[PDB]
Every structure is written in structure tokens, then in C-alpha cells.
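Archive entry. Fields below.
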Amino acid sequence: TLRAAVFDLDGVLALPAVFGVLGRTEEALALPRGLLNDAFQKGGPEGATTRLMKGEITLSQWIPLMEENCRKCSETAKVCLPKNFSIKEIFDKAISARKINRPMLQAALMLRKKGFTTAILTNTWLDDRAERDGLAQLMCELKMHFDFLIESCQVGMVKPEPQIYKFLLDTLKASPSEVVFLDDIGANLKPARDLGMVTILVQDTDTALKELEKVTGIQLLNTPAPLPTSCNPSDMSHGYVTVKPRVRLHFVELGSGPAVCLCHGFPESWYSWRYQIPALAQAGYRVLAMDMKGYGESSAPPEIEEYCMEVLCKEMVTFLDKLGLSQAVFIGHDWGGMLVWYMALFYPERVRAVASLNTPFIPANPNMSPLESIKANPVFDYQLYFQEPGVAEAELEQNLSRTFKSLFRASDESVLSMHKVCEAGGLFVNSPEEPSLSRMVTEEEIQFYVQQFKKSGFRGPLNWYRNMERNWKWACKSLGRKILIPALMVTAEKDFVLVPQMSQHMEDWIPHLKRGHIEDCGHWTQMDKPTEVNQILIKWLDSDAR
Amino acid sequence: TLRAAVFDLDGVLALPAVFGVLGRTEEALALPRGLLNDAFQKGGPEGATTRLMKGEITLSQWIPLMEENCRKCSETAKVCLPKNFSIKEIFDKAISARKINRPMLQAALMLRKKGFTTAILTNTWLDDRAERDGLAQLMCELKMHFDFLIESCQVGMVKPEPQIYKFLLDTLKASPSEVVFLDDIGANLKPARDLGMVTILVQDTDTALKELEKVTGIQLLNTPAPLPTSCNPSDMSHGYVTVKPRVRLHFVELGSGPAVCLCHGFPESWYSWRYQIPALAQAGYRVLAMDMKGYGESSAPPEIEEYCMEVLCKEMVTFLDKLGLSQAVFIGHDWGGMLVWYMALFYPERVRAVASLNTPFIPANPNMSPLESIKANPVFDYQLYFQEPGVAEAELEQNLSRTFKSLFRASDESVLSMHKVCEAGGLFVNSPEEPSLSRMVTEEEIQFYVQQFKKSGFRGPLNWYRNMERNWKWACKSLGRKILIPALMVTAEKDFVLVPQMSQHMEDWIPHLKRGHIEDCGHWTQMDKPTEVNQILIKWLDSDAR
Ligand SMILES: O=C(Nc1ccccc1N1CCOCC1)c1ccsc1
Ligand SMILES: O=C(Nc1ccccc1N1CCOCC1)c1ccsc1
Ligand SMILES: [Mg+2]
Ligand SMILES: [Mg+2]
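PREDICTED_STRUCTURE:
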């Protein structure tokens, strides 16, 4: 029956409420109880606060009006304001104090996911204070989670006036009994209740949520931990740079702050970073998530040498020049992990800090032909399968759904061994036609990869594997160098190919290397353990790249 | 006969040279003359400095090797190093000290413009110092001006070895007598001279430039002031955001730092900002140059109300949300100028600072119908011509070259009066078929605009003019507000439509308004006075938006 959920901001999605501070400030300052609130509310519908909340005046204009309401209110109660009394100060402090109430956001989140139309409905102001950015951030983070955000000052109406509710109903395209509205102020519920909306007076969050679970029949409270926010491809800023005339790189770009350039592996996409992109933007970074040369909307020239590490590197440098970035943080996984290490070795001036997931940095052996090196470990056999142009393309292109549904699996869900893949004559030989969906991915997400790989298929991607001689010879030029820029390695416990012990000696060549480790995590690190990954990167970014 | 010019970096494109600092440091510290340089050069082709310059080792690795060469050199001369002696310190200071030698860059610039292949050829290092960003910036600014940049450490060879010169000749695709090479070190010229290259030992810049003018037959020295750097469309990072399902905004993006969003006017393009984009990036800003709704690669829906100021505003807010920017500096010209004022009025939380070129902020008159208001000033007559859908489109679309070649003119170059354009029945009625090229623009630049406007033509653009009722009613909601965020107005002396006196009262509504004025500047401010514009914006950004 209920189809919409509407959340107040102050005192509901955001705590502590700012009436909260007015209560305390009076006590702190030992003023007559409620005096500050009488000021705030002076003149009712025609007073300074209502005009603010309607958007007739800005917050900087109302401040000295409240001041006056604070002089008048105290004259009338026969008490003197403190020397140094500051309305700007109290409110600045109150506003920066408020944070997102996480459990209310997650309860709203879940209701959206179960198909409700959600909205925020708030009395707020046109904020022009020097420090306005704090709240703009907070509102930005909140709104991307809701169908609508209605602001008293934007629409020229306020709670409790009965016209905002009509506007609300009208915006939701729904009738007053399909709607639940939670608000911390009894008076705001009053009129919603009249048109016959379910309401919830919000005191403590848990009780509110109990009422809300009880009224919607959906489990909200004590629910398992939700995934981090993901990215919907078509709501992203997409970017394009020509790095040389036949070749353009595509990327998705979110946030502001130091540039963070994410380099996916084989056979993946910018989308492989879908759970990190909002997290890092939100952490204060400018995220640039590549389609690496050969993939998605980047170009995919056919020639093998277009993908040697040297050329891939030069072209990433070109990508910075053309974007006007002197440096970026380089974060890579799998093949992108190899790429960022070599960026650190060959262009340290352009790398603010380097990090790799799963992919260790192991210096080339100048006295062992590079093919011999690979052949010396059974687990890399699929690499030799990749050599002969045509063969792996044919198999991997033959059924795209199957391909990704076969590859993108957690550590206990495997359906192919990376084992004797040459001898068996295929990567899919004893594995199913229609695999079951890994718990890591929805059908839709696989379809995204499927649709990307239909632009160029696997020639480009596989070519990354087809330059061992060339890459070996190039890498040998760096054998005297060490990596002395900031640097993080993150090992994944149950990656059975890029195993953690492989990384054991990295300190020899990167003496200040910082480490992270993720347990119970397979090869597809970003999507397998998105929560742990974000937390490790955000902590290392704030301390080492900031 | 000469076809290529090659410039050393240290001591040629960049001053003071760092051997410069080694000389001084010894004197400062009263060390045996040349001792520091004997350290630096210890071991000749097999010493620590050569391995650095070949890229065998990084700069952080060489530092403590130089230290040792500084101990050994002093033992042998029988003197003690100062307590606190610091190689890192000396070099940090030396490196941050070096700047681009402007007159050498401009002489290289001009030679490129006269069709020479240019390059930089430098002994330099893989820099991994904490402070490496300083020099990465400097190199970035330099390289975008040259066909090639050859670095000893990137190519594994050094000046004076004769193999780098072969590589040089080979990279330039030219023979040793088609090449001039300027370098501050006699020894580096030695081998270039042998293969028969013209060379120039570079002591003071002016003499060097005299030699270079004398050898190329091109005026380099005392030449008039060059325009600021422009943007070549196809070397730009191009970005795309869907702000609602039928509608995407396109922009060009350069630099890093606080976001600066440039809003062009009618009937223009992101390209109208071509001279500001590199300047502001270079000044430490993240420039986002829009195609405004209706133009270039942004979408151009046909309906008139898609272009009222309210909707244009909401959609720019949406553009920030989707890019993950809580704020941006909004800079506008003409119609974009009107837009940024209203952004400041309606979304101050999202505007870091606001600036307008030519376009004043004049509050709506609530007691005068908006059509009457326009009709009350002869100079705005072309605005009424724009009203009736179809008419202006027909004329403006009829010959695109003519249209822009007619509009884009300086103040003394006019070929149409904005005068009685309704009565005369066209904006072009008594003006030429093939106008002469304004001094402000090259044929190619006009062709760019021509090619952009062929995607949608003028319906979208003209619609910006077709919402006066609607925009008037919307604007009246803001009559109580003031603009109290940071704010700059820049008036153009000889803009005869958006005249400077029009801006006279703006202080009434924007009490902290900062001003700039440009003399001898017509309506197309950015391209008319690109040097003065950049300087006014960069100075206001650094003090007010930083
Ligand atoms: O191109 C490959 N690896 C690589 C990539 C980039 C730089 C160096 C290397 N290595 C360094 C160690 O020596 C071999 C080349 C490769 C690995 C498996 S299939 C092809
Ligand atoms: O839409 C126009 N102007 C405008 C634009 C945006 C906001 C307010 C306004 N004004 C405010 C002053 O009153 C009239 C509307 C316009 C001007 C010449 S042709 C159409
Ligand atoms: Mg509340
Ligand atoms: Mg030199």
C-alpha cells in the first residue's frame, strides 16, 4: 500500500539537530531557558526566520536580524547578553557539528532498493557564509541517495504550511496514504496526518526505524552491512583524450582534490572500480577511472606492440599532459598493477604515489629469458595459452556472458582451474555453458561488461600479454633504480595466481613500502571486498598522498 | 635552409642554471673554488652523475652518492665540510629557483610558428624527491610548446656522447645542417658542430637571440607582445554529462585546483575561452569550459522553456552533482554572465565565487512588464528581432561564415549597427556578403564556430532570448536577497550594447563587489583583450577564490 518514504533532514537524516544547539547554547551561557528559540521564532509566519526558510533572504542577511531578535527577547526577559555573543559563531559551530545519521540513510537506502520513491523534505536556507561548503558537501552526499530533495528555500514554501505537502504529493506522483513521512517536529506531522499520510515522530533513531519497519513490512533495523555505493554508468561524467592520432583513452571522473587514476586489469573495465569511485570522491579525491588501452570506449588498435609496457606508459604520461595534470596517484589491479609500478619506475616525477592490488613488483631477471621465467610456474600456464594470436580471442569472444560469468567468481566458487590450460586446449574445456551467477555480481553488471567487450573484443586486451621480450628488455633498463616514492601493496589472501608470498621481497626494491592484506578475498579484489579495499586506500591516501 | 631549432633546458629555456648554484654555494660557504663541481663530475662517464643522467639511478639515490663525492673531494683538497652541509638542501633550493626564461620560450614559440620543428634536448634526471612536483609543473608548461622533448634519463644517453645527437637528428627527421642547437656548455656544442649543425653558445639571452635571428632570418628580439597560448580543440580532454534524459552538457577540461566553470554567451562556444583555458590551468585552476545548453556538442532541444534561466540553472547544478563538485567558481560573458549572477542568487552554496564579463547584474523591475523594459532602450532592438521563432534562425543560419565574420569584430571594425534591426528587417540588411576578416580571429577559428553551429544552428541559442516573462517572474523571487559571496564585475569600455555605466549601481545589491575594466575592448571580451582578461581573472581568483 505505501509506495513513498519522505525523510526530514534536521533531526532525521542529520544529527545533532540545530535546535539541539540552541538548547545547549542557552544552558552553556546560563540564559533564560528558551530565550534563543524565542529569538529564532520571533514574528511567526512574517518573521526573519520564515523569510529565510522561504528563500526571501540569504543566511548572511538573516544573521544580523536574529541578532536583533536576540537583543529584543533579552530586553523583554530583563537579562543581558554575554560580551562576545555571536550568532554567526553559534550557527557555524552547530552546522559543522551535524553529520549524516548513517542508520537512517541506510534505512532510506533499503526502501529505495525495495522500490519506494524516496525524498528529503526540509526547511533550509540559501547559505552564503564563507563556510557554506561544509553543508553543500553534506547535502551532495545525501541527495544522490534519493529521488527528490525538496528545500523550503528553493520552492518558496515551508513546513508546516499546508501547501508544501501538496507540492510534496504532487512531486511524488502519489496519494497521501501511499506516503510515510518522518520528522522530528510534531507540528510538521500535524498537516501530513490530516491529508492521511502515515507519519513518524522521530525521537531516537531506533524507535523511529521500528515504527518504519512496522509500517512498511521491510526489515530495516539490524540488517546486514550494505555494499558501498556503486556507479550507474549513464550518470557519470565520461571523458575522452586523444593521446596520438589513432588512439583515444576514455575515463569516468568523480570528485575533486588530488587526482587519483585507477587502472583496471584483464579483462576488465573502468567499471571494475564501481565501488571505489564514489567512496574516494567522497573521501576528497578527484577519481579518474580508465578504460585502459584496448578496452571499452578507449581505442583498441590491433598491433601487438601497441601494448608493450613502454608504449602503454608513454601514452598514460601523454594523458596527464593533455589533461594538464603534473601528477596523479596511480592505483592498479592485475595488469594495471604492473603498469603503475612501471609508471613509478619510469616517470616518478608524474606519480604522486603508487598502489597495486594483488600485483607484486618483481624486477626482471636479466639472466633468464622471459618465456623460461613464466614456464617455471604451473599457475601461469594460461599466460602461454594467450600467446598465439587468434586462439584465446576465439574462445573468449565465443560467448561473452559465459566468459565473464566464468571469470568473475569468488575464491570458493571457481569453475575453471588455471591448470594445464594449454594441454586441455582451452580455458573453458571442462566448465559449464551457462554458469551460475557469482554472489559478487548481478546479471545486469555482467551485461555491462558483455556490452563493453562487444565494441572491440579481446585482441587488444590479450595483447597486453604478448610483449614479454620487449617488456623484459625495457624493464632491464630500470634494474639500478629503487622506488622511493610513496607506495602501497595490497595482497589478497585467496588469489591463487597472484599469491601474497609472491610479494615477499618487495621491500628490497621499495624500502618504504606500506602493505595491506585482505583475507578471504579472491582475484577480483575491488568487487570481492569493496568495503575493505576502500578503507585501505582511503587511509593510505590520507596519510601518504595528501 | 634551417628547418629545426633545438634548445637546451638548463641555462637556456630555464634560469638560473643549476651549475649557477654550485658556483655560489662554494662562495657562500667559502669552500675551495670548483670543489662542489669536482664532486658533481667525479668519475666522468662512469661516475654517479652520468648514471643519474642516463636514468640508471633516481635523484634520491644519487644524493647520497654526491655526498660521498663531496667528502672525498674535500679530503683530497684538505678542507672540512660545514656542520649541517646538505646536498638535498642545495639542490632543492637550486631547482625551485630555476624559472622559465620567458624571452627564450617566445623566440622558440615564434620559430615554431614560422614552421620550424622545435625540440628541447636536456641532460636531466628521474626525480623522486618529495618536492618533485615543482619541476614536473615547469616541464609540463615547457613541453606543450615544442615538437619533442628529449631527456637524457628517458633515452639512456647524455650530452656530449655522440649517440644522443644521432638520436636527435633521427627524431627530427632532418640533416645536421638543417639544425640549430643552443646550449650553455661549449662541450655539448662540440659534437653537434662536427656533424655540421649550426650551434650557439648561450651566455646572455639577448646575444644568443641575435645570433639566432642572424642565422634564421626571422625577427625574434624586440618583437611585439605575443597572444596568450590558445587551445587546439582536438588536443583537449572533452567531457559529457547527462543532466536529464534528453540533455547532455559537453565541456573541455584543463588543469587541477579549485573548479572554474566558464560560461560563454550568444552565439558562442567553449572555444570562446580558448585564450583563458591554458592561462587559468597554468595559474593552478581546474578549468571547465562549457558548451552551454543549445550549442556545440551539448544538446539542443527545440522547446523555448528548456532555456528559461531557472531550468538552465537547475541543470548546471545537476552538472555539478553528477561531476561530484560541491562548488565551482562561475565565470560568465554575455548570456553566461546573466547565468552566473542567477547561480549566485539561487544556489550560493554551490558557487565558490562569481564573475561576469560585460554583463551587469540589474535586478528585475516588479512594476514594469519585462517587454516594456527592453523596448525602453534603442540598443536592445535586436533582442525584439529575436522573438518570433524562425525569423532570426533563417537569417543567422543562411550563411555561417558570414554570420560569425559579421559578429566577431572589434569596436572600430563594425559592419552592422544593432540599430532599428526590426524596421530594417534583418541583422545583416546593409552589410556585406563576404566580410573582411577581423584582426581578432583567423579564418580557421571562424571555421571552428561554423562547424559547431552546423550541429544544431540557432534555435537553441536564440531561445535563451525567448523567456523574458518567465525569467522576470522567477527573478522577482530573488528581490529580497543580496549577493554576498565573492564577486567580480569586468566592464568593457567599447561594448556599445552591454555598456559600462549599465553596471553603475551594482554595489547596491552586491556590496563587496570587486571591479575590473578594460579599455579599448569591444563586446567579444575574451578574444579582444585576452591578455588583460587573464590577468584580471587570475589576480581575482588568487585573492578571492583561493
Ligand atoms: O610482459 C610481461 N611482463 C612484464 C610486463 C611489464 C614489464 C615487465 C614485464 N616482465 C618483467 C619480468 O620479465 C618479463 C617481462 C608479461 C608477464 C606475463 S606474460 C607477459
Ligand atoms: O530573459 C531575459 N532577461 C532575464 C534573464 C534571466 C533572469 C532575469 C531576466 N530578466 C530580469 C529583468 O527582467 C526581465 C527578465 C531577457 C533579456 C533580454 S531578452 C530576454
Ligand atoms: Mg527537523
Ligand atoms: Mg645547460
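CURATOR_NOTE: Residues 1-16+97-217 of chain B form a domain with the Rossmann fold fold (CATH 3.40.50.1000).
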